[PDB]
RNA sequence: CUGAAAAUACAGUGGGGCCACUAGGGACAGGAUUGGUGACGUGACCUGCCGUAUAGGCAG
């Protein structure tokens, strides 16, 4: 699964019709987040889900925050955001309601967010998830 | 399978001549628009060379 996801990162710049900060995640990686088995049960994460996210944590690690956009500025939708947090979709809308998670362009007053349109950056959606500590994080070892 | 079928309105043409709207004339007095407001930092326009030159030319 790592080597399958490694070629998509190396050949990310090849596929670009627009800039990284304007392109969606499913345009480069393709369905690999919303196909993943859900963690609605117990808050017990799937071994497929543990392996996917732990690759994305080292992606933003290798792609620091510079003035040129890179692979860590790909746009993520509210459903793909809901899976990466492992919570309900209303709970992730409520974080948007109290401006905890910051969209990536301003909707103009009658814009209610399309649930499939890529709203948030991959970047700080991960950093929000690393603000919550669970036992098998890479920080301790 | 119709108040059923069918159907060539046509040819020609001189509105013309004349004409005084005119005289007179006060729109005028009064007037409080007012309170309150962040254009940008997910962005390409960089790094150097020649030249006396904020002239003018150039390399990725």
């Amino acid at each position: 699964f790592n080597t399958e996801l490694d070629e998509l990162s190396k050949n990310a710049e090849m596929k670009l019709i627009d800039l990284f900060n304007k392109t969606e995640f499913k345009f480069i990686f393709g369905d690999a987040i919303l196909a993943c088995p859900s963690t609605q049960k117990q808050s017990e994460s799937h071994f497929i889900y543990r392996a996917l996210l732990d690759y994305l944590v080292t992606l933003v690690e290798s792609n620091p925050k510079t003035k040129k956009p890179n692979a860590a500025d790909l746009l993520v939708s509210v459903l793909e955001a809901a899976t990466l947090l492992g919570t309900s979709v209303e709970q992730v809308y409520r974080l948007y309601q109290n401006g905890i998670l910051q969209t990536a362009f301003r909707h103009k007053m009658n814009q209610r967010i399309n649930p499939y349109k890529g709203a948030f950056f991959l970047r700080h959606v991960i950093e929000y998830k690393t603000s919550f500590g669970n036992d098998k994080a890479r920080m301790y070892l």
Side-chain angles (χ1 to χ4, degrees):
Chain A
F1 193 52
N2 280 6
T3 55
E4 190 166 344
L5 285 171
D6 281 316
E7 49 91 350
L8 294 172
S9 294
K10 289 179 290 189
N11 307 349
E13 193 113 60
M14 300 301 98
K15 287 175 197 172
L16 287 181
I17 63 176
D18 214 316
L19 329 177
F20 276 111
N21 53 317
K22 298 296 183 179
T23 51
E24 286 177 315
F25 194 79
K26 68 176 60 144
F27 184 80
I28 300 299
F29 285 95
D31 175 55
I33 305 221
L34 55 137
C36 190
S38 292
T39 177
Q40 85 294 346
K41 62 164 235 279
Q42 198 270 296
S43 195
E44 224 164 38
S45 349
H46 206 272
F47 82 97
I48 294 165
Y49 175 78
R50 280 162 188 165
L52 167 66
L53 148 102
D54 284 12
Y55 174 70
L56 296 179
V57 168
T58 190
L59 184 60
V60 302
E61 197 279 310
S62 59
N63 294 321
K65 292 89 188 194
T66 201
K67 209 95 151 177
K68 171 225 48 156
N70 54 45
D73 295 295
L74 291 172
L75 298 212
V76 170
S77 194
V78 255
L79 279 168
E80 282 120 270
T83 54
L84 285 170
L85 293 217
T87 54
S88 67
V89 99
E90 172 52 35
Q91 182 59 33
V92 106
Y93 291 147
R94 218 280 308 122
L95 291 180
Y96 171 80
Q97 228 315 114
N98 291 59
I100 306 298
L101 272 295
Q102 218 45 54
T103 157
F105 40 73
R106 236 306 146 239
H107 101 287
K108 248 13 292 266
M109 216 73 115
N110 268 345
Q111 216 289 315
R112 215 314 203 135
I113 355 177
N114 183 29
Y116 311 98
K117 193 212 131 323
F120 315 114
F121 291 99
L122 187 90
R123 202 175 283 293
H124 54 249
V125 128
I126 280 173
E127 272 92 84
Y128 186 72
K129 194 61 187 302
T130 65
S131 75
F132 292 81
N134 71 325
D135 305 350
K136 308 189 210 215
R138 298 185 176 183
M139 299 173 215
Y140 305 127
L141 193 65

